[PDB]
């Protein structure tokens, strides 16, 4: 049986992007918005059963938890055509609809409150899974109700499913618009702080990675944060495509992710993109070769993570997986990994072997594709401690600050202290540290 | 004379002799000579051969 | 490379150490008790010298211009040159 | 990895310059005027990486800079057929379009406050260099603009991109029409003073030279500034022509000149031309040989530099490059050679061995020659300190005389003191001496501390 793969939307960020998700799922798998495979998606060829269920022989429901704190939102993708695509015995909501308040720790005891009920939930959607692989857990990392049930789901899926993978999709706030949720780096350090001790990896979507793509290489003026989600499920669909498409190698997200997180803190992945285009520059249908593809692919504007330029730490990339998708010469896959180790277009690890990984995957049948080629990149690279030092520097200036810490002190997790927020702060910078570590030799050393 | 030409490209095979083996693309020559200095001054017991063809097929 | 005999063979016997390393790992739940820890090691250097004998396989394939997909496969391994820093040779793991 | 070459067009003549070797460029290498290769620019034998960057995969842009601080000349290059040749991220025009007001200090000013800028731009150029040789500015030594902001350029260049090549096509001021700019001595001193300390190589673009020849050679009354610049850019094509026929030998713009520049000092060169020919008489293909090319070369007639006849002193050739462009035998290269040997046409410096260079190159393909054999000369030839002499003898006539020296005096670099400018004048003065002693066997001790 497939390894089914739990959605979790959480608060206003994390469910709008889990009801993009949805919807890129659905188009690239030919599900109509009821759940049901359209007729013309005869090519049985995609896995839904990996990351959606089947409510009949003929349709597929996603395997998708939509929750919040505050039924706007739930009631919002509830409202959508695809209301009926999710099997609705997987949907918490909240009861109150007030949310957590932009409160880690309100979102923490909320996460307590709804304990019975989300943990019933998961159950039943474990119940459901034949060889069920994990969660994945869509949220934001600022607010209240996606950062702080975050981390309560995160700590009570670690103690109820200590044997089973958790993988989170997760929503990092922007780090270059200022956040008018002042406790957001306490909601933060909280996320990182379940992320390092319960979760085995973090794929960290940064708000101000998907807002400088859409203003620089989108051409976006205002990226909606419509638009940033449907960037993201796009993103998901293109690293899902080899699940969903299977084949000689990658046939399991942990077999996939296993080769990308070589230590439990080592679990920061950094993203790519391939073919990447501007929105008005779709129209011109290169023939990049998969030289020219790594090429385009190695050129920052073509990344999908914007790491801040650390001019300290001699950044360098851990790991790299490019996952390549459409017509591929694998003579051209050959020069191009010869191209970029001769031209070292890529700082690897020097205490340990280390390459550029490359997958070559299917597209969705049912889904026609404007693209010959299309690629993703995974990479593990020192480069994202710039934005987990960034994080830490907004975290130390927040407690420093004292800011906005009076609407947690109202919630049971923060009433006395913001001490998790402090030593989340500190184990981050110990993080940092040891990522601008592996970009070193001593990387050898490291935790010796 | 026809038959050679057309079947073994032997004029062609000429040409391609006096560009590369007779060092006539000297343009590809010296960057090839620009890339192997830092490889060239090497001790000649650490070479590998693959990096040596890889190198050659990047300066190409 | 079912052809290249002696390859196949150094492989199968990488295969093999493979194997039992993987069930070594896999009984040791907790931290490698001392026979854990003794098979751990006696892998380590049966997994060094055999990684020397295929870096040594491969730098006589390349002097013997056999096989181009060899020094491919060689290459991708050593991209980073970690294992041409390492002589071929598989990383010390560190205990 | 080409060595890519930045081409920095400066000031109204610099950047008028720069447009028409763009132009030449495209029009040699088959590029459309809106960067794309034409469909007959089939020859992919030349480097366009060199001096051009692809903007798509059809477009090639050249990696050419179009720095101005008057906005007239930008507006018209962008309102020309090639505005879609250039990277618009590679054309810099002053906001205030008030140019430097012809004062070498106030250009350097300038260029010290757009430094921030210009150089972010530089740097990014740079980084879409994978084997960045250096920068080319085209630029006049007598303005403010050209001159003040290459001077300007030229230190930050050399400051912050110490390992990175200085090329420079500077226009020495017209030594035979009197300049209106009294202060251009000045702006002649402070742009030679940055070309002795910051610049490796500087082109020599005499307009004195460039107007005589113009009226003697091309029979126009009155030399337009747009046929001096059409020239130039014919020049600058015939230097490029390496670049874009690769050969056996010399094919780069380091391995090409590290052959003609023997000292740091000695690194003042001269060019020559063949056939100059006016348009009109392409019409007869003249199976020219080599022994002929080399022999109008020779002639000072020839030489696109009007050096005077110095009587007092023994002036004489240190060093010949002849870039010979068309069909060329290589057995009469070398009875050609033989012949200009035993013929001592040329004197040589008596202090080291020196020959004339000869280079024997292909025409472009994708550009329509109308003559079957064409030619550059470079020469150092010590004759080139008399203009060089002349610019330093209307240097001491200016600061003897002040003038123009309350608008310099204005600008900081000259508002307390023309301590550069005196420092510029000795240093001209060594570089005289030098290439005088340069002309005698006792040059082996010339530049020698004991000397």
């Known amino acids: ?448 | 004379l026809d038959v050679l030409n057309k079947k073994y490209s032997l004029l062609d095979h000429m040409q391609a002799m006096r560009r590369y083996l007779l060092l006539g693309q000297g343009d590809f020559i010296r960057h090839l000579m620009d890339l192997l200095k830092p490889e060239l001054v090497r001790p000649a017991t650490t070479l590998y051969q693959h990096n040596l063809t890889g190198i050659l097929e990047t300066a190409v | 490379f079912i052809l290249l005999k002696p390859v196949f063979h150094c492989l199968n016997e990488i295969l093999d150490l493979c194997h039992s390393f993987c069930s070594l790992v896999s009984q040791n739940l907790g931290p490698l008790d001392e026979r854990g820890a003794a098979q751990l090691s006696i892998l380590v250097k049966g997994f060094s010298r055999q990684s020397s004998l295929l870096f040594k396989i491969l730098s006589s394939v390349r002097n013997h211009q056999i096989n181009s997909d060899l020094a491919q496969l060689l290459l991708r391994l050593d991209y980073n040159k970690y294992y041409t820093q390492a002589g071929g040779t598989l990383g010390s793991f560190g205990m």
């Not at chain 1, 060829?45 to 269920?53: P, Q």
């Not at chain 1, 699940?243 to 997200?253: E, I």
């Open chain 1, 1 to 448: 049986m497939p390894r089914e793969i739990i959605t979790l939307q959480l608060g206003q960020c994390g469910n709008q992007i889990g009801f993009e998700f949805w919807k890129q799922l659905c188009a690239e798998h030919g599900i109509s918005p009821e759940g049901i495979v359209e007729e013309f998606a005869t090519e049985g060829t995609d896995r839904k059963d990996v990351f959606f269920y089947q409510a009949d022989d003929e349709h597929y429901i996603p395997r998708a938890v939509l929750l919040d704190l505050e039924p706007r939102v739930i009631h919002s993708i509830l409202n959508s055509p695809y209301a009926k695509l999710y099997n609705p015995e997987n949907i918490y909501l909240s009861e109150h609809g007030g949310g957590a308040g932009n409160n880690w720790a309100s979102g923490f005891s909320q996460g307590e409150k709804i304990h019975e009920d989300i943990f019933d939930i998961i159950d039943r959607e474990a119940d459901g899974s034949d060889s069920l692989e994990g969660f994945v857990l869509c949220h934001s990392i600022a607010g209240g109700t996606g950062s702080g049930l975050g981390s309560y789901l995160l700590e009570r899926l670690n103690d109820r499913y200590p044997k089973k993978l958790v993988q989170t999709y997760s929503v990092f706030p922007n780090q270059d618009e200022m956040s008018d949720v002042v406790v957001q780096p306490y909601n933060s350090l909280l996320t990182l702080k379940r992320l390092t001790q319960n979760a085995d990896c973090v794929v960290v979507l940064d708000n101000t990675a998907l807002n400088r793509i859409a203003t620089d290489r989108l051409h976006i003026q205002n990226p909606s944060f419509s638009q940033i989600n449907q960037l993201v499920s796009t993103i998901m669909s293109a690293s899902t495509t080899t699940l969903r498409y299977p084949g000689y190698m990658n046939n399991d997200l942990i077999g996939l992710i296993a080769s990308l997180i070589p230590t439990p803190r080592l679990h920061f992945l950094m993203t790519g993109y391939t073919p990447l285009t501007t929105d008005q520059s779709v129209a011109s249908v290169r023939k990049t070769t998969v030289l020219d593809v790594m090429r385009r692919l190695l050129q920052p504007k073509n990344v999908m993570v914007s790491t801040g330029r650390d001019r300290q730490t001699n950044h360098c990339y851990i790991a790299i997986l490019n996952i390549i998708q459409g017509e591929v010469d694998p003579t051209q896959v050959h020069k191009s990994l010869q191209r970029i180790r001769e031209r070292k277009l890529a700082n690897f690890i020097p205490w340990g072997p280390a390459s550029i990984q490359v997958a070559l995957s299917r597209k969705s049948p049912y889904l026609p594709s404007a693209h010959r080629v299309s690629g993703l990149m995974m990479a593990n690279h020192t480069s994202i401690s710039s934005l987990f030092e960034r994080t830490c520097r907004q975290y130390d200036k927040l407690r420093k600050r004292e800011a906005f810490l009076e609407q947690f002190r109202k919630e049971d997790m923060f009433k006395d202290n913001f001490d998790e927020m402090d030593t989340s702060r500190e184990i981050v910078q110990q993080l940092i540290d040891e990522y601008h570590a592996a970009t070193r030799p001593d990387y050898i050393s490291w935790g010796t």
